[PDB]
Amino acid sequence: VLTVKPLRDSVKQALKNYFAQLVNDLYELVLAEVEQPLLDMVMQYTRGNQTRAALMMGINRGTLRKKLKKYGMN
Amino acid sequence: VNSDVLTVKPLRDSVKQALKNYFAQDVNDLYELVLAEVEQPLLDMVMQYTRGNQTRAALMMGINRGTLRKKLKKYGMN
């Protein structure tokens, strides 16, 4: 359901390009590059309504706010 | 944005489009959906990079062996 085709193929290519450029933070690095836009799009979709955003993502409001804070989006 | 080292042309742009296209199609599991979609290829590429060496993959990922093993199992990659 996530295509651009499958989104995962874009992740693979990005990692392939990255490795050709070379680390101990690859997981957080990728997470930041994917969670930030997810948060951006879901909040955009709900017009900034955190409860609706949290419910759509399947996480509680507290976790949503923690992530928004982590990425400096608060 | 945290980094600009992941390009396909930032990777984040591809995530937004997939989400844009997704919304254009109620949902209650978007986080897990996106998490699985990115964790699988990440684990795949990291393991290919370290030629199967789990300890090297975990160190590169910045997680411990147990966590990497748990993720690998979650997607039946072990």
Residue A30 near residue B66 (C-beta atoms within 8 A) = no
Closest listed residue to residue B43, CA positions, set B35, A6, B15, A53: B35
Site of tokens 């590059």: A33
- HSE (side-chain half, CA atoms, 13 Å) at B34: 29
Tell me the residue range of the domain where A28 lies. 1-74
| DSSP category for residue B63 | S
Rounded CA-CA distance B8/B10 in Å is: 6
The CATH number covering residue B12 comes to 1.10.10.60
Q: Give contacts of B70 with chain A, Cβ < 8 Å.
A: none
Which positions ≥6 away from B59 have C-beta within 8 Å?
Answer: A24
What is the count of structural domains for chain B? 1
Question: Does residue B39 sit in helix, strand or coil?
Answer: helix
Q: With DSSP H G I counted as helix, E B as strand and the rest as coil, what are the percentages for chain B, rounded to 5?
A: 65, 5, 30
Resolution (angstroms) stands at 2.0
Query: What is the 3 state secondary structure string of chain A?
Result: CCECCEHHHHHHHHHHHHHCCCCCCHHHHHHHHHHHHHHHHHHHHHCCCHHHHHHHHCCCHHHHHHHHHHCCCC
Rounded CA-CA distance A40/A33 in Å is: 11
Contact status of A5 with chain B (Cβ, < 8 Å) = no
Q: In chain B, positions 27-66, which contact chain A (CB-CB < 8 Å)?
A: 27-34, 37-38, 40-42, 44-46, 49, 59-63
Burial of B42 (0-12, 13-18, 19+ CB in 10 A): buried
